[PDB]
Amino acid sequence: AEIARSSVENAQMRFNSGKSIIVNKNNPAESFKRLNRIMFENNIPGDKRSQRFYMKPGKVAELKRSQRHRKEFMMGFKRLIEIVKDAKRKGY
Amino acid sequence: KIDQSLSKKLPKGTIYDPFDFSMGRIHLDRKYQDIMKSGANPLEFYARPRILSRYVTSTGRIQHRDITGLSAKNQRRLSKAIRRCQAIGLM
Amino acid sequence: MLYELIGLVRITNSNAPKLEAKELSSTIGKLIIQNRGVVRDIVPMGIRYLPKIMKKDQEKHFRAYHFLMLFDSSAAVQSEILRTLKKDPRVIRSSIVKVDLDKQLDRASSLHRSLGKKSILELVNEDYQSI
Amino acid sequence: TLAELLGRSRIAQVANNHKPLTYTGKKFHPTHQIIETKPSTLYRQEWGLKSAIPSKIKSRYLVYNDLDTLERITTFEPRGGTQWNRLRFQEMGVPIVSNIGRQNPFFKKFNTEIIGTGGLSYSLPGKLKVIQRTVVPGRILNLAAIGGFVADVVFFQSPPSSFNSMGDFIRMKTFLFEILEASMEKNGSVSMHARLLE
Amino acid sequence: PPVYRLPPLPRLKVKKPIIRQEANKCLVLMSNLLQCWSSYGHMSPKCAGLVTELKSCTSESALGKRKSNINYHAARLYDRINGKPHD
Amino acid sequence: DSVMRKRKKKMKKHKLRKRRKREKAERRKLSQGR
Amino acid sequence: VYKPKEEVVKYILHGKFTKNNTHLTFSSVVEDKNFHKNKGLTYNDTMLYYLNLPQKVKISLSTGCLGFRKAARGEYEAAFQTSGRMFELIKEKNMLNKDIEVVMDDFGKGRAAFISALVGKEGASVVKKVVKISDATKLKFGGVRSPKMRRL
Amino acid sequence: EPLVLSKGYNIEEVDKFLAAIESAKRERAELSGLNTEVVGIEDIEKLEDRREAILRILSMRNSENKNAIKMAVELARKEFERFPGDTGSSEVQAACMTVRIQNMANHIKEHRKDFANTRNLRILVQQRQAILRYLKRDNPEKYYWTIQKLGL
RNA sequence: AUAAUAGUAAAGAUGAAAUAAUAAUAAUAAUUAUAAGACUAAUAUAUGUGAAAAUAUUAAUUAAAUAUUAACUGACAUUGAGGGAUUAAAACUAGAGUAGCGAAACGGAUUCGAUACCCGUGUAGUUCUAGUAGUAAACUAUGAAUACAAUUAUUUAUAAUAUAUAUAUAAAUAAUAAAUGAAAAUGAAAGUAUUCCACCUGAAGAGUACGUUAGCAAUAAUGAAACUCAAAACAAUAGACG
């Protein structure tokens, strides 16, 4: 009670999660956008969409594998194009 | 007065070059921009919910080995320590 | 074998925060002892608001007094200790994890092991200095 | 012997080093050895590397890490040009205390730590070129890069108008500075002081 | 750590290499009208200081406005960058 | 050939329909005391 | 023993911005400088209350209310135009005296709008009194299963 | 039996090794320039417990069945060996597989649906037999000696 | 789902709509609060671990599974007819449970028709417990074992070095050489060889009939012939087509 009324709600001075982005008043877009980042960086949004229709476990595993493969080629492609750019720059 | 994204501020310690003093350079740098990573049984920290709090997307989520980039064993033991810490009251 | 119990006890004494915690620390102990087994290292971890409001016995404990006891007993006594714990209304979220000593004759508490240490005999000469 | 020949090969005279050719890390000491080529070889497009350097390169100085690599090319950056910074240190004419030179001027089984001037200086500390040095012009960072070496600008009185005169082009503007002195922290980093004549 | 060699491909071209060109400048102008017409009503007493812009955007050309060279760079620097074994 | 395998499917399904009709005859007077 | 003592604290504007409809709900916390004027409850008790102060919906609003009906209740116009009403109402009911937090939930086309509307012009007089934005999308950790895949 | 322990720790060696400390402690002080006071009994009480704990912390009644087995295989090898050391003799190998075959079995007599470890028990049995079959093809005398010895 | 609460008129679903016990009994949304079940995000590559089924929420116990030396054993093996053991999803027999899902069912859509796709309820079942049964594209469509053969890059295990380096080993994964191959392609095997087991000998009829065994049953295994054709199948190619 009193002993903790002083407790500045110690609790809520760092109590919640990352699902929050205090707004620096003034700029509002940025703040709202700051959430767009967290949201789009904890994949929260996309997961909701997935957790809508559950495919057979083998089917979802296959999909996951395919996604992984796609990811790995994209960064393999990126690596290749960076080398190509370097070669262009140098003279090769 | 000027914006940040346009003015390298090499510390004096370094070796500034004629190009180094250029925008190209600024762009270049951007492009090319951990006691656990050191080698301590990440599982031993099965409690200390402080240490584990680090490699965490701050959403009760561990990270793919694209960010954490910890050793397979280190990351898996860190993940196990986080999961074990969930069992160990704190975190 | 060597076990560990990072249990989180509840508190009610606006006054003493380590009342029950200590009282339970006695209980568990008394029994870890009267049964062939050595208590080893106790490392009061004090208090830390629980990340979530952990409702125990419909009390919704938003905080708990973490504590740790490094002990050693047969499976049964170790198993039995689990039973005691969950079934102790005071404790809120218990846990006994193993500490195999196959390699190191004496193992420290998980905590010190992440502090760089590894053994009590080590952690003792670590303080021995004085006399 | 084949090996004897290679053991003296200029290719091996150059040690190996896989340090990145971008090194975004703060730089104090050089990372690789520049390969100098006589203008002749440049037209002959010869650089002594595993593969010939592309005509696109028109410098006579390049730095290489991989004679050749899986990508079927040599990993080199034709931007090797430290030749300028170190020479400018000579253009600046200032010696380094180098802590205490017990017996040997640089003093010190292996002198890995406190390597010394680091080949940035091989001249007697005291000389009369000091005659108040030679107020070498430097590019004020706010600190002032003199001859590729930043030196903290010092002055009898703070002159804001001087900074206002160059506005945001303080680094673009170059002011002569009577270098107070420089020093090589064991991490091979030179710390120096400038004399803003404003 | 970083490392991801690819498998041989017909060619490592790039899809629609996105060079980036601003959205029909007019499209932004017409949009702001409806970004200041939703409120304040049609031809907002404020939008006078707006339609002034969407005027000539049309006029002669109702649509004020009715590349890249990486594919060859790729075609030429792939049979070199790809770490294919010998043959 | 998958199409050929699918035909088995049509044939097994057809036989399953016959089995259902045969199932009526099964467990009946024929399979009891006879 | 005291009697109710209510001094609303912050104001909460919440919404479930789903695909087929968008909802906005303005609520107000509630409090009392009395809970602790009683020695019967233990110290813990009080914080529990504080940690989770009560709450009262003050302006339930859904796209359809503003006019749209059926499919349309899922588009953008709806939200942009079913937000203003919400805000406009926070004004008339004289509810802008203390801070307000936002909690965009789910991701129907409406979320963006209610976020445009807050920032742009119709949010103006309100935005100002908003503290921290946030979010409460509900994702499940396995949990229960979800519809088969509509072979749409 | 009571007082047994792990990793070669016969209680006697403990009694004699623990004892070494007694001799050492006192004799450390005999020399130098420090006198003898509380060390008249060095807390017989404290040392008595020290050893005691050691015993609880090294008592098979408080260790792991695996450890009891580590002891056993030895016992058997040493009852079936051909000479000090031999650990490859068919009977030694058989005897060793025997100890386990039991453990494994009592294990299965609880986890009746554990099948993988059931495959194990069997493979072993099939295996012991295979080596036992070899010894009856070699030192036949030994074979029968051994089998009747192990109980088959 | 269920009250508590305050709030108002729609809610919800779809291509768009209908309905149902949706909501003027005050709904949905909100926020608290009880109860009941299933499941287990990231990490997470099924990397891996398992004989194969399978298998990534946490811990406890039990058990198996590693490398390298060292001591021993002394060919004790290679794998195998038959047999035995395990064996996904569905199904079944008991007993409990039953949130969500969802055969069947019934209703609403759409459509020319719609016993479908779409949508609303939603029962057998999906869960556990003890069983039973023994089949899957149980697929790497590739039986097991041993000896051997040309490179590279990554994992990575691991010894070593004068750990943090560049080295020697293995192991896996990815590109290939040779070789093989109807080609697709295989790549330390689909190569070079040796050993052992299983199985095939045109298509239909047919894994059907019948007999026999096993099962509570559905069924599972075993498994013919007559009749009729000069067909039937696969990889590579053009071309037409979507």
Swiss-Prot record, chain A:
Subcellular location(s) per record: Mitochondrion
Protein family (similarity comment): Belongs to the bacterial ribosomal protein bS21 family.
Q: Which GO terms describe its cellular component?
A: mitochondrial inner membrane; mitochondrial small ribosomal subunit; mitochondrion
Q: What subunit structure does UniProt give?
A: Component of the mitochondrial small ribosomal subunit (mt-SSU). Mature yeast 74S mitochondrial ribosomes consist of a small (37S) and a large (54S) subunit. The 37S small subunit contains a 15S ribosomal RNA (15S mt-rRNA) and 34 different proteins. The 54S large subunit contains a 21S rRNA (21S mt-rRNA) and 46 different proteins.
The record gives the effect of mutating N36K as:
In MRP21-3; suppresses translation defects of mutations in the 5'-untranslated leaders of mitochondrial mRNAs
> What range of the intact protein is shown?
86 to 177 of 177
Source species, domain of life: Eukaryota
Q: Which UniProt keywords apply?
A: Mitochondrion, Ribonucleoprotein, Ribosomal protein, Transit peptide
What GO molecular function annotation could you give as one example from this UniProt entry?
Answer: structural constituent of ribosome
The gene it comes from is: MRP21
Query: What is known about what this protein does?
Result: Component of the mitochondrial ribosome (mitoribosome), a dedicated translation machinery responsible for the synthesis of mitochondrial genome-encoded proteins, including at least some of the essential transmembrane subunits of the mitochondrial respiratory chain. The mitoribosomes are attached to the mitochondrial inner membrane and translation products are cotranslationally integrated into the membrane.
Additional detail: Present with 1270 molecules/cell in log phase SD medium.
This protein is called Small ribosomal subunit protein bS21m
From Swiss-Prot, chain E:
Motif window: Cx9C motif 1: 26-36
The protein's matches in InterPro entries, at most eight in alphabetical order, are given as:
CHCH, Ribosomal_mS37_fun
Give any Gene Ontology cellular component: mitochondrial small ribosomal subunit
Q: Which controlled-vocabulary keywords does the entry list? A: Disulfide bond, Mitochondrion, Ribonucleoprotein, Ribosomal protein
**Biological process per Gene Ontology, one example term:** mitochondrial translation
Entry coiled-coil feature ranges: none
UniProt motif (Cx9C motif 2) ranges: 47-57
The GO terms describing molecular function are: structural constituent of ribosome
**Disulfide-bonded cysteines:** C26-C57, C36-C47
Which Pfam families is this protein grouped with? CHCH (PF06747)
Residue stretches making up the CHCH domain: 23-65
Q: What does this protein do?
A: Component of the mitochondrial ribosome (mitoribosome), a dedicated translation machinery responsible for the synthesis of mitochondrial genome-encoded proteins, including at least some of the essential transmembrane subunits of the mitochondrial respiratory chain. The mitoribosomes are attached to the mitochondrial inner membrane and translation products are cotranslationally integrated into the membrane.
> What is this protein identified as?
Small ribosomal subunit protein mS37
Organism, per UniProt? Saccharomyces cerevisiae (strain ATCC 204508 / S288c)
Gene, per the UniProt record: MRP10
Curated annotation (Swiss-Prot), chain G:
Instruction: Just give the chief location class.
Output: mitochondrion
Q: Name one GO biological process term.
A: mitochondrial translation
Among the entry's GO cellular component annotations, what is one?
Answer: mitochondrion
| GO MF terms held by the record | structural constituent of ribosome
Alphabetized, the UniProt keywords read: Mitochondrion, Ribonucleoprotein, Ribosomal protein, Transit peptide
Report whether Mitochondrion shows up as a keyword of the record: yes
- Which residue positions does the secretion signal occupy? none
Q: Where in the cell is it found?
A: Mitochondrion
Tell me which family the UniProt entry assigns to this protein: Belongs to the universal ribosomal protein uS11 family.
Describe, as the record does, how this protein assembles with itself and its partners: Component of the mitochondrial small ribosomal subunit (mt-SSU). Mature yeast 74S mitochondrial ribosomes consist of a small (37S) and a large (54S) subunit. The 37S small subunit contains a 15S ribosomal RNA (15S mt-rRNA) and 34 different proteins. The 54S large subunit contains a 21S rRNA (21S mt-rRNA) and 46 different proteins.
Other facts noted in the record for this chain:
Present with 5300 molecules/cell in log phase SD medium.
Q: What does this protein do?
A: Component of the mitochondrial ribosome (mitoribosome), a dedicated translation machinery responsible for the synthesis of mitochondrial genome-encoded proteins, including at least some of the essential transmembrane subunits of the mitochondrial respiratory chain. The mitoribosomes are attached to the mitochondrial inner membrane and translation products are cotranslationally integrated into the membrane.
The name on file for this protein is Small ribosomal subunit protein uS11m
Q: Which organism was this protein described from?
A: Saccharomyces cerevisiae (strain ATCC 204508 / S288c) (Baker's yeast)
* Gene name, Swiss-Prot/TrEMBL: MRPS18
Which portion of the complete protein is shown here? 66 to 217 of 217
UniProtKB/Swiss-Prot annotation, chain H:
Q: Where is the major localization of this protein?
A: mitochondrion
Q: Which GO terms describe its molecular function?
A: rRNA binding; structural constituent of ribosome
Query: What does its PTM field state?
Result: The precursor is processed in two steps involving mitochondrial intermediate peptidase (MIP) and mitochondrial processing peptidase (MPP).
Whether Ribosomal protein counts among this entry's keywords is yes
Which keywords label this protein?
A: Mitochondrion, Ribonucleoprotein, Ribosomal protein, RNA-binding, rRNA-binding, Transit peptide
Q: How does it assemble?
A: Component of the mitochondrial small ribosomal subunit (mt-SSU). Mature yeast 74S mitochondrial ribosomes consist of a small (37S) and a large (54S) subunit. The 37S small subunit contains a 15S ribosomal RNA (15S mt-rRNA) and 34 different proteins. The 54S large subunit contains a 21S rRNA (21S mt-rRNA) and 46 different proteins.
Function per UniProt: Component of the mitochondrial ribosome (mitoribosome), a dedicated translation machinery responsible for the synthesis of mitochondrial genome-encoded proteins, including at least some of the essential transmembrane subunits of the mitochondrial respiratory chain. The mitoribosomes are attached to the mitochondrial inner membrane and translation products are cotranslationally integrated into the membrane.
The name on file for this protein is: Small ribosomal subunit protein uS15m
Q: Which organism is it from?
A: Saccharomyces cerevisiae (strain ATCC 204508 / S288c)
Interval of the full protein contained in this chain? 85 to 236 of 286
